[PDB]
Subunit: 27 residues, 3 copies
Amino acid sequence: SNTIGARLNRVEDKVTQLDQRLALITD
Amino acid sequence: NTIGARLNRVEDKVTQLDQRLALITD
Amino acid sequence: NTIGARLNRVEDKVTQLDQRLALITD
């Protein structure tokens, strides 16, 4: 669960979530 | 996609997010 | 830099964006 690839999965999901929050803030 | 491709992808997306937030605040 | 360093950096940038955005919206 701590390889580059595993940690990449988690950061990808968080980025997706942040992109959605930012959509509520601006274009 | 491959780990290499996905790492480039996220790095550039994070930059994009930062640029979009910056246009509004900071 | 190395793949590990790049991932550490992107994680770092994401934490920072997360905290800023969390002040603005849930």
